[PDB]
Design an enzyme around this catalytic site. Sequence first.
Site, PDB file in Angstrom:
ATOM      1  N   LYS E  10       0.809  -1.220   0.000  1.00 11.69           N
ATOM      2  CA  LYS E  10       0.000   0.000   0.000  1.00 11.69           C
ATOM      3  C   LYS E  10       0.849   1.279   0.000  1.00 11.69           C
ATOM      4  O   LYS E  10       2.040   1.230   0.302  1.00 11.69           O
ATOM      5  CB  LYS E  10      -0.981  -0.018   1.180  1.00 11.69           C
ATOM      6  CG  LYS E  10      -1.788  -1.289   1.250  1.00 11.69           C
ATOM      7  CD  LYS E  10      -2.948  -1.152   2.193  1.00 11.69           C
ATOM      8  CE  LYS E  10      -3.756  -2.426   2.218  1.00 11.69           C
ATOM      9  NZ  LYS E  10      -4.853  -2.319   3.193  1.00 11.69           N
ATOM     10  N   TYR E  51     -11.536  -4.056  -4.011  1.00  9.24           N
ATOM     11  CA  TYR E  51     -12.210  -3.928  -2.729  1.00  9.24           C
ATOM     12  C   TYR E  51     -13.729  -3.983  -2.872  1.00  9.24           C
ATOM     13  O   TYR E  51     -14.459  -3.542  -1.978  1.00  9.24           O
ATOM     14  CB  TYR E  51     -11.778  -2.634  -2.031  1.00  9.24           C
ATOM     15  CG  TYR E  51     -10.461  -2.756  -1.291  1.00  9.24           C
ATOM     16  CD1 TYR E  51      -9.395  -1.907  -1.565  1.00  9.24           C
ATOM     17  CD2 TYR E  51     -10.286  -3.730  -0.314  1.00  9.24           C
ATOM     18  CE1 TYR E  51      -8.190  -2.024  -0.879  1.00  9.24           C
ATOM     19  CE2 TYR E  51      -9.099  -3.855   0.373  1.00  9.24           C
ATOM     20  CZ  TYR E  51      -8.054  -3.005   0.094  1.00  9.24           C
ATOM     21  OH  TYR E  51      -6.876  -3.164   0.795  1.00  9.24           O
ATOM     22  N   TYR E  59     -16.196   3.001   5.304  1.00 10.41           N
ATOM     23  CA  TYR E  59     -14.820   3.383   4.999  1.00 10.41           C
ATOM     24  C   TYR E  59     -14.468   3.265   3.518  1.00 10.41           C
ATOM     25  O   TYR E  59     -13.356   3.599   3.108  1.00 10.41           O
ATOM     26  CB  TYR E  59     -13.837   2.544   5.831  1.00 10.41           C
ATOM     27  CG  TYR E  59     -13.995   1.033   5.670  1.00 10.41           C
ATOM     28  CD1 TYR E  59     -13.449   0.363   4.583  1.00 10.41           C
ATOM     29  CD2 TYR E  59     -14.693   0.284   6.613  1.00 10.41           C
ATOM     30  CE1 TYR E  59     -13.599  -1.018   4.434  1.00 10.41           C
ATOM     31  CE2 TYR E  59     -14.847  -1.092   6.478  1.00 10.41           C
ATOM     32  CZ  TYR E  59     -14.297  -1.737   5.390  1.00 10.41           C
ATOM     33  OH  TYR E  59     -14.453  -3.101   5.264  1.00 10.41           O
ATOM     34  N   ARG E  87      -1.039 -14.364   4.849  1.00 13.06           N
ATOM     35  CA  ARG E  87      -2.035 -13.769   5.743  1.00 13.06           C
ATOM     36  C   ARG E  87      -1.520 -13.674   7.179  1.00 13.06           C
ATOM     37  O   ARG E  87      -1.695 -12.657   7.851  1.00 13.06           O
ATOM     38  CB  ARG E  87      -3.317 -14.598   5.737  1.00 13.06           C
ATOM     39  CG  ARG E  87      -4.411 -14.017   4.899  1.00 13.06           C
ATOM     40  CD  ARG E  87      -5.331 -13.151   5.732  1.00 13.06           C
ATOM     41  NE  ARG E  87      -5.689 -11.948   4.996  1.00 13.06           N
ATOM     42  CZ  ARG E  87      -6.565 -11.041   5.416  1.00 13.06           C
ATOM     43  NH1 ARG E  87      -7.204 -11.211   6.573  1.00 13.06           N
ATOM     44  NH2 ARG E  87      -6.800  -9.965   4.662  1.00 13.06           N
ATOM     45  N   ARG E 100       2.100  -6.024  10.186  1.00 14.07           N
ATOM     46  CA  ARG E 100       1.291  -4.961  10.772  1.00 14.07           C
ATOM     47  C   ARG E 100       1.588  -4.791  12.256  1.00 14.07           C
ATOM     48  O   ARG E 100       1.574  -3.679  12.778  1.00 14.07           O
ATOM     49  CB  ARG E 100      -0.194  -5.205  10.528  1.00 14.07           C
ATOM     50  CG  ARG E 100      -0.638  -4.908   9.112  1.00 14.07           C
ATOM     51  CD  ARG E 100      -2.111  -5.252   8.950  1.00 14.07           C
ATOM     52  NE  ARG E 100      -2.564  -5.224   7.563  1.00 14.07           N
ATOM     53  CZ  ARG E 100      -3.795  -5.554   7.182  1.00 14.07           C
ATOM     54  NH1 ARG E 100      -4.683  -5.931   8.090  1.00 14.07           N
ATOM     55  NH2 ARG E 100      -4.140  -5.501   5.902  1.00 14.07           N
ATOM     56  N   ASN E 110      -2.219   0.383   6.740  1.00 14.21           N
ATOM     57  CA  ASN E 110      -1.591  -0.786   7.314  1.00 14.21           C
ATOM     58  C   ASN E 110      -0.688  -1.550   6.360  1.00 14.21           C
ATOM     59  O   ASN E 110      -0.615  -2.777   6.413  1.00 14.21           O
ATOM     60  CB  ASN E 110      -2.626  -1.722   7.951  1.00 14.21           C
ATOM     61  CG  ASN E 110      -3.739  -2.142   6.990  1.00 14.21           C
ATOM     62  OD1 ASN E 110      -3.634  -2.029   5.762  1.00 14.21           O
ATOM     63  ND2 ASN E 110      -4.816  -2.652   7.562  1.00 14.21           N
ATOM     64  N   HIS E 113      -1.812  -5.535   1.744  1.00 20.02           N
ATOM     65  CA  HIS E 113      -2.965  -6.415   1.567  1.00 20.02           C
ATOM     66  C   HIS E 113      -2.527  -7.815   1.149  1.00 20.02           C
ATOM     67  O   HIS E 113      -1.580  -7.978   0.371  1.00 20.02           O
ATOM     68  CB  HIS E 113      -3.941  -5.881   0.524  1.00 20.02           C
ATOM     69  CG  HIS E 113      -4.906  -6.921   0.039  1.00 20.02           C
ATOM     70  ND1 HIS E 113      -6.194  -7.029   0.521  1.00 20.02           N
ATOM     71  CD2 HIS E 113      -4.749  -7.930  -0.851  1.00 20.02           C
ATOM     72  CE1 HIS E 113      -6.797  -8.048  -0.067  1.00 20.02           C
ATOM     73  NE2 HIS E 113      -5.942  -8.612  -0.902  1.00 20.02           N
ATOM     74  N   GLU E 124      -8.618 -11.835  -7.078  1.00 22.23           N
ATOM     75  CA  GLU E 124      -7.676 -10.711  -7.016  1.00 22.23           C
ATOM     76  C   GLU E 124      -6.515 -10.856  -7.993  1.00 22.23           C
ATOM     77  O   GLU E 124      -6.068  -9.862  -8.582  1.00 22.23           O
ATOM     78  CB  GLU E 124      -7.176 -10.500  -5.597  1.00 22.23           C
ATOM     79  CG  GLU E 124      -8.240  -9.977  -4.683  1.00 22.23           C
ATOM     80  CD  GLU E 124      -7.935 -10.264  -3.246  1.00 22.23           C
ATOM     81  OE1 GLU E 124      -6.771 -10.608  -2.961  1.00 22.23           O
ATOM     82  OE2 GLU E 124      -8.846 -10.151  -2.401  1.00 22.23           O
TER      83      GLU E 124
END
Lengths: 131, 131, 132, 131, 132, 131
Positions: E10, E51, E59, E87, E100, E110, E113, E124
């Site tokens: 990100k 998303y 949000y 993950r 994170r 954060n 992803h 994705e």
Amino acid sequence: GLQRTLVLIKPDAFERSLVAEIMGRIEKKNFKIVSMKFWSKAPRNLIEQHYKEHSEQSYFNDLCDFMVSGPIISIVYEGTDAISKIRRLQGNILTPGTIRGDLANDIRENLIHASDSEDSAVDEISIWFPE
Amino acid sequence: GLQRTLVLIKPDAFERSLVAEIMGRIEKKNFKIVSMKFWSKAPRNLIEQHYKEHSEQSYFNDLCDFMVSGPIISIVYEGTDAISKIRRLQGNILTPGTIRGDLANDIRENLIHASDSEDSAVDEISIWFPE
Amino acid sequence: GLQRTLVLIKPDAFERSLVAEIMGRIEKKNFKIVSMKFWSKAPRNLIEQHYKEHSEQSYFNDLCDFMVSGPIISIVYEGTDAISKIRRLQGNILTPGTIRGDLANDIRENLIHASDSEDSAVDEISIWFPET
Amino acid sequence: GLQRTLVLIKPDAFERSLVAEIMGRIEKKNFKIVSMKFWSKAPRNLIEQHYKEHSEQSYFNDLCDFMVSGPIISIVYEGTDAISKIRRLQGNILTPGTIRGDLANDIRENLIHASDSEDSAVDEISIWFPE
Amino acid sequence: GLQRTLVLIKPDAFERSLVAEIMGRIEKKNFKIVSMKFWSKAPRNLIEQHYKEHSEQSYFNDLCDFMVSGPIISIVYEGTDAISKIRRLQGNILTPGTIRGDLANDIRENLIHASDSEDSAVDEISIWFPET
Amino acid sequence: GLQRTLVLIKPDAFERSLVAEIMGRIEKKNFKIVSMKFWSKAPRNLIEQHYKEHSEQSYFNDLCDFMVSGPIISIVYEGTDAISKIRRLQGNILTPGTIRGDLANDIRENLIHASDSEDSAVDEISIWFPE
Ligand SMILES: O=c1ccn([C@@H]2O[C@H](COP(=O)(O)OP(=O)(O)O)[C@@H](O)[C@H]2O)c(=O)[nH]1
Ligand SMILES: O=c1ccn([C@@H]2O[C@H](COP(=O)(O)OP(=O)(O)O)[C@@H](O)[C@H]2O)c(=O)[nH]1
Ligand SMILES: O=c1ccn([C@@H]2O[C@H](COP(=O)(O)OP(=O)(O)O)[C@@H](O)[C@H]2O)c(=O)[nH]1
Ligand SMILES: O=c1ccn([C@@H]2O[C@H](COP(=O)(O)OP(=O)(O)O)[C@@H](O)[C@H]2O)c(=O)[nH]1
Ligand SMILES: O=c1ccn([C@@H]2O[C@H](COP(=O)(O)OP(=O)(O)O)[C@@H](O)[C@H]2O)c(=O)[nH]1
Ligand SMILES: O=c1ccn([C@@H]2O[C@H](COP(=O)(O)OP(=O)(O)O)[C@@H](O)[C@H]2O)c(=O)[nH]1
Ligand SMILES: [Mg+2]
Ligand SMILES: [Mg+2]
Ligand SMILES: [Mg+2]
Ligand SMILES: [Mg+2]
Ligand SMILES: [Mg+2]
Ligand SMILES: [Mg+2]
């Protein structure tokens, strides 16, 4: 062998979160912190004094503005041949292996100051640590 | 003094899992990625272009073989004085402190390529990022 | 091509917990361990042999006492141009980027020994690993 | 609560050049090497002893094969509560923060072994350091 | 055995210069890059697709504006149990040891992803690497 | 979200040269130093106050002796949810991933103190930073 030397952690270090990286490089070379101050914004007189030899240079005003644009830390370090070794540790933005060499790329924003002689060191240690 | 330079991460970086270590040294010195491209295997055409200046050397075909023996990443970096500084960062297998100095030990498999001049930068960027 | 060289991790590396740090620098440069011994206390004659060329120096006795003051590790590393490149890796306390440059600050307690020639290499290997 | 425990650095550590990374995590937590031994190839005898408790499992021979497929280091470590703490340090491929958590991704090739009880420690130390 | 999963670095990772740090954590766990793209600014519909399951949340708009506020990198990683293990690597800001947990302290910014299922992974991957 | 919390770097950190390692873990989680003091030997009253809740425990005297046996640094840190997050960062000597988990192994010598509640935090920030 035993000397003391003055180090300034510059504001670009706080912006870029390199504060510990910098201090850590000095610690691993086995120098000891002997005194230390955190300044959220350094009193501009302190910085003017600190860079007095530079008062006539064209970069002096921009320099002072930068040194006051964020926090700095003033440290007195002690150890064998401290002034010379911490200077080498500081290095320059050209050659890798040093703080500046690995982490910096600007003529003004270079993370750290280190005294460069026995004289500048007593002087600088007195500006930042009058006591 | 804003410049752009071209860096290749070579296949030995992938083999030895040093890709992030290499990109990290360039990131820590404040250079910014402007374009990036992953090649699971590069077209020998592009490799031969990139290394055209070396087309008449003993090592020319071995080097091309190696360059296509596994993935590579082509990155355009940007920042003050990028070409020269990233070249120093790359260094050589003789000088510790640099990428090759710390991590590589061979005349051929040396982890990384970086443009060495303003002219070879413009030319190499055009090879790898024709768009 | 391939050479082997002898490394000693000195007792100050144990005292300062830098053993892994130093071995890692050599590992990241692609040198392989071919033999290795941990000496909780190296026998003094091994140390004196190792430093035999130094026997007439002012520092000779102090050096040996130091080298026996804590554990040491002896390692044979193998790799291209191992002798000279690990020498460069070791460096000196004046040269940032090297083991001594980044982590040492003393004339005697300088973390690491590395063979400086092909002959000293061959000789030092035999001292610490006589089984060959 | 001073203890002694036995750690094996497995052949995948050598293959992937993680030997120092692993020893370093144990060193940083203040454990001290008491004995150490490099094996370029371990006698299958010793491996089968070390893994005797597993002699009737599916994976038993694959594991022995792997254990002799390359070098290993056997280390006896010492320090407060050594057996349990070094076991937590080893962790598992599911929990980041530990050696296996950060560095390994396999049921068999998992970089390291550490004694799991006071009894298996005494027994394993005796396998590897009979003297 | 082998799986592939989609990672996004990100824009806060670029702003904070943590790109290499994050990619390194995944690299040291033995996951391989199979595809990768640098987007100086990712097209908004790509982000919104990515998303899309989030489109009705409070949000949603802020998240997309953020994801377009700087560069991002999209990567397909391959390895044993890639989806769930990356993950775990990502984790959350409450859990030390993870990306994170050690480096992030925000609900939106954060760093990373990572696909959370086999289907979201497959989906994705197609969004960011439609050439397949 | 925004809180301040008090951190003490304990003497075992100075002995073992973990000062930067510790501070660096907090910095990378993005907390900011808001004030900071170096004490070469902390005034014993300060430490007695600081650990008041403990004045009746059997470890209190040994504790005070230790906290005064070398330097300490007192830091005020600021950031979202600071008290709770820096506490997690501090951790315990059992579970890896934390400061204590990775670097410590003693019930008394554990490198760092971090306030554990909004109340202990205002109190502790006043002991060390009366101004
Ligand atoms: O052209 C210049 C040269 C210096 N500096 C800044 O002011 C200090 C000047 O001192 P000097 O040139 O001697 O740098 P140093 O000795 O610290 O390396 C440097 O640290 C820079 O941060 C600057 O802003 N412009
Ligand atoms: O004897 C040689 C010299 C060069 N190279 C390879 O070809 C590239 C170009 O050679 P050069 O001497 O220009 O290396 P540079 O330092 O520029 O990368 C090197 O990076 C090596 O990967 C090689 O295989 N053998
Ligand atoms: O004045 C000295 C010089 C050397 N040494 C020690 O003994 C070794 C001397 O060998 P040399 O001077 O050749 O150092 P090196 O070859 O290891 O760089 C050094 O590594 C030091 O540990 C010492 O104690 N006093
Ligand atoms: O399904 C398995 C389980 C075990 N092992 C190997 O055999 C060792 C012993 O198994 P155990 O479950 O006890 O692993 P531990 O966590 O104790 O090391 C492991 O470390 C693995 O290297 C394996 O190859 N396959
Ligand atoms: O209240 C929130 C929660 C989520 N996010 C952002 O949008 C993603 C939401 O997806 P999710 O809550 O499932 O987080 P993740 O799956 O990535 O852990 C997060 O990563 C954040 O970047 C946000 O901006 N506000
Ligand atoms: O049995 C003990 C327990 C505590 N301590 C020390 O005194 C502090 C006591 O506070 P607490 O037990 O709540 O530890 P913390 O909350 O800081 O983890 C600890 O940091 C230890 O350094 C000690 O010396 N002996
Ligand atoms: Mg100067
Ligand atoms: Mg060239
Ligand atoms: Mg010599
Ligand atoms: Mg078990
Ligand atoms: Mg989710
Ligand atoms: Mg408490």
